[PDB]
Design a protein around this ligand. Structure first.
Ligand SMILES: *[C@@H]1O[C@H](CO)[C@@H](O[C@@H]2O[C@H](CO)[C@@H](O[C@H]3O[C@H](CO)[C@@H](O)[C@H](O)[C@@H]3O)[C@H](O)[C@H]2NC(C)=O)[C@H](O)[C@H]1NC(C)=O
Ligand SMILES: *[C@@H]1O[C@H](CO)[C@@H](O[C@@H]2O[C@H](CO)[C@@H](O[C@H]3O[C@H](CO)[C@@H](O)[C@H](O)[C@@H]3O)[C@H](O)[C@H]2NC(C)=O)[C@H](O)[C@H]1NC(C)=O
Ligand SMILES: OC[C@H]1O[C@@H](O[C@@H]2[C@H](O)[C@@H](O)[C@H](O[C@H]3[C@H](O)[C@@H](O)[C@@H](O)O[C@@H]3CO)O[C@@H]2CO)[C@H](O)[C@@H](O)[C@@H]1O
Ligand SMILES: *[C@@H]1O[C@H](CO)[C@@H](O[C@@H]2O[C@H](CO)[C@@H](O)[C@H](O)[C@H]2NC(C)=O)[C@H](O)[C@H]1NC(C)=O
Ligand SMILES: [Fe+3]
Ligand SMILES: [Zn+2]
Ligand SMILES: [Zn+2]
Length: 341
């Protein structure tokens, strides 16, 4: 049993995975697909074992029978005595971010503006904001709400992809993987930073991690936190320090999923793999770190301190929470219970 097949989304994740594979002595090997959905299909077919997923994708995976295994745990300030692996996860803050200089833009004036989304089907980038917008407008036409968008995974010729940029060669426009310039947390924040969009749907951490010298990347080098504002549901604008009083939702952390017949073994191997290449890993600062990919968030989020045990051996619904599961199901009616594949 002792060989885990990890699924990588896109060529950049594939490269990192290959490095991990070499360093793990082939205890981990690599399968690769173009999209997260395609990776879930590989796992369902038994052609890969596992991958780490945003909550929106956990919903897709879970409807198809895949189970949560371990969750991303970032650094916190509660349960400080417990080991990271045993410390309870605290979830992240889904936010809507704008430029301070874009004065008078509020939650209530988002119609017909330009939006930047992590990807279709993702928690902070899509399910939360679009679910909120569908409810408030009483309309399923979320594809006509914003004048233009970058929402990787949408129809490339549609307005929802109009702001996406693709790769260096301008290939792979609006593809839901790291090849797309504006993909994921960092890509969506870049879309806002460069004024391609008026609003970015990301998480609190993303803003902090890419401002005030935290990034060094060419587009982020010079970005200041005070130049950004958060949009609150009450129509107010707040500095990015008040994320706890001005968010769209609290999201369940990204988590590893696998088939239930492989979950126990995937868990065993990963706990060992992070002991070697995780935050305080025996071979991280010397050979390879599993949670570092130059602010690109490949395979895992770069802010992951460890993968933590779940406890309560939760179903995918228990992991996501009944509050969030029903929120997706209400949004999915616009696009009742079955596997998508
Ligand atoms: C978009 O609107 C949806 C419909 O109003 C809404 O779904 C509703 O969510 C609430 C709260 O999560 C559910 O009410 C629940 O209230 C308590 C929670 O403790 C439970 O005891 C009840 O059993 C009940 O589940 C509604 O049932 C649910 N409505 C429907 C028809 O599914 C979404 O939350 C809204 N989406 C967003 C993103 O806000
Ligand atoms: C919004 O996201 C921010 C980025 O994740 C986050 O700020 C981070 O908060 C932690 C503590 O919660 C800080 O603490 C770290 O640094 C100290 C020493 O400097 C260490 O002792 C800790 O172990 C820990 O590593 C981070 O420095 C800080 N990150 C940055 C770059 O500012 C906010 O807390 C988030 N806001 C909300 C409301 O959740
Ligand atoms: O919903 C019933 C179900 O809840 C489970 O707790 C949840 C889940 O496992 C956690 O990952 C999640 O963490 C947070 C999430 O962002 C959001 O739900 C928020 O409201 O709360 C957390 C952050 O404050 O919490 C979920 C419950 O809120 C239980 O583990 C499970 O036993 C129960 O059946
Ligand atoms: C690859 O996996 C094997 C099997 O788990 C590892 O070998 C084990 O090492 C552990 C931890 O030090 C010991 O408890 C076991 O006795 C070993 N088992 C066997 C059968 O070899 C190995 O350490 C892993 N290698 C890497 C680099 O990940
Ligand atoms: Fe997410
Ligand atoms: Zn809240
Ligand atoms: Zn349970």
């Amino acid at each position: 049993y002792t060989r885990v097949v990890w699924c990588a989304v896109g060529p950049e994740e594939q490269k990192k995975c290959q490095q991990w594979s070499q360093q793990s002595g082939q205890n981990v090997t690599c399968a690769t697909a173009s999209t997260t959905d395609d990776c879930i299909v590989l796992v369902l077919k038994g052609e890969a074992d596992a991958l780490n997923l945003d909550g929106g994708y956990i919903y897709t995976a879970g409807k198809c029978g895949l189970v949560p295994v371990l969750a991303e745990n970032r650094k916190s300030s509660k349960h400080s005595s417990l080991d990271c692996v045993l410390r309870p996860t605290e979830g992240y803050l889904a936010v809507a971010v704008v430029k301070k200089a874009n004065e008078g833009l509020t939650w209530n004036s988002l119609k017909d503006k330009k939006s930047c989304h992590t990807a279709v089907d993702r928690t902070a980038g899509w399910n939360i904001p679009m679910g909120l917008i569908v409810n408030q407008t009483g309309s399923c036409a979320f594809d006509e709400f914003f004048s233009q968008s970058c929402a990787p995974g949408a129809d490339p010729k549609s307005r929802l992809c109009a702001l996406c940029a693709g790769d260096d060669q301008g290939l792979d426009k609006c593809v839901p993987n790291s090849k797309e310039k504006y993909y994921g947390y960092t890509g969506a924040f870049r879309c806002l930073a460069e004024d391609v969009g008026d609003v970015a749907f990301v998480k609190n951490d993303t803003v902090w991690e890419n401002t005030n010298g935290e990034s060094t990347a060419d587009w982020a080098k010079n970005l200041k936190r005070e130049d950004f504002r958060l949009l609150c549901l009450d129509g107010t604008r707040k500095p990015v320090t008040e994320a706890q009083s001005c968010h769209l939702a609290v999201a369940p952390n990204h988590a590893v999923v696998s088939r239930s017949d492989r979950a126990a073994h995937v868990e065993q191997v990963l706990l060992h793999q992070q002991a070697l290449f995780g935050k305080n890993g025996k071979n991280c600062p010397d050979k390879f770190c599993l949670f570092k990919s130059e602010t690109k968030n490949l395979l895992f989020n770069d802010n992951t301190e460890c993968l933590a045990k779940l406890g309560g051996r939760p179903t995918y619904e228990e992991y996501l929470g009944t509050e969030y599961v029903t929120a997706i199901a209400n949004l999915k009616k616009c696009s009742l219970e079955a596997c998508a594949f």
